[PDB]
Symmetry: C3
Subunit: 108 residues, 3 copies
């Protein structure tokens, strides 16, 4: 393609790429705030469960819980030590893949 | 619609951004569903707690007016906001416009 | 760039822009529902902490909690644990409008 056509399409491309990256970063920030808040809720709730005599008899759900869980998606405690949320990190691989892609287009 | 070699280039750049959008959609939906699982587990256990803890078994659950109490509370209670109907549904992002792209380029190509 | 070539690349552009906007709105909706749910949990848990006599000896964590994070029993959820409204930005969209505006003013 002509170089001016390629420059224009490349500019529109860059624009949408930057918008995607912006949304990616903003969503990741808000999700991390939610993760911190939820993990704090879990911490305090576990302390409460460990110190409240009226609920000291209630066990933590065993593995079958995941299908007990499947009523709403498809007793006992669902929140446990292993309920904390990991860090959410969106991938950036496709960006460098684009860079390499149009680099080879500009060298071929 | 334009020259075929030009259109192939713009269509390749288009593919790249479409694939990036799909990737972001899938990753965000995954993390949001994990959060939904965690929040629903919190709701379940908190309701058990509220139903068995004698010091708080007198507190009623908030009725429908809560939502405007809630709106005022966002700017600035005697009852529970989390109830049986506080669980989060599964979040599913839409994909219709993706094949709308297919339809678009299909009409463009002849 | 000939006007018909620019129209084709511009239509493909519009499509991906619209898809980004759709995803932005849906993600913001789901995130806000999560925020409402978490804030309701926080509110009720604070009520609970205020009315459960057996656990009132437990303090709320002081500022050192943030380094507790980098790894002591105290409360992490407090009055200032609520989640703000999530609002994704649109600054770059009108910049696109201006971008193609100057491109079409050279036509
Ligand atoms: C959290 O991440 C660790 C390591 O990154 C992994 O071993 C663990 O299984 C993850 N937990 C969940 C619930 O995804
Ligand atoms: C979940 O979705 C169903 C149908 O879409 C609806 O009837 C129900 O009220 C929803 N629940 C919540 C908590 O939004
Ligand atoms: C929410 O944002 C406002 C300003 O936008 C800020 O004053 C407040 O501290 C924030 N809430 C937090 C950080 O919990
Ligand atoms: Cl694009
Ligand atoms: Cl709780
Ligand atoms: Na394009």
């Amino acid at each position: 393609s002509g170089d001016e056509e390629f420059s224009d399409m490349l500019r529109l491309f860059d624009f949408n790429k930057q918008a995607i990256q912006r949304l990616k970063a903003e969503a990741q920030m808000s999700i991390q705030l939610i993760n911190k808040a939820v993990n704090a809720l879990i911490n305090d709730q576990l302390i409460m469960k460990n110190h409240l005599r009226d609920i000291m008899g209630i066990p933590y759900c065993n593995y079958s819980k995941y299908w007990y869980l499947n009523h709403t998606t498809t007793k006992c405690w669902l929140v446990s030590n292993g309920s904390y949320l990991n860090e959410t990190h969106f991938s950036d691989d496709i960006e460098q893949q684009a860079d390499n892609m149009i680099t080879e287009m500009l060298q071929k």
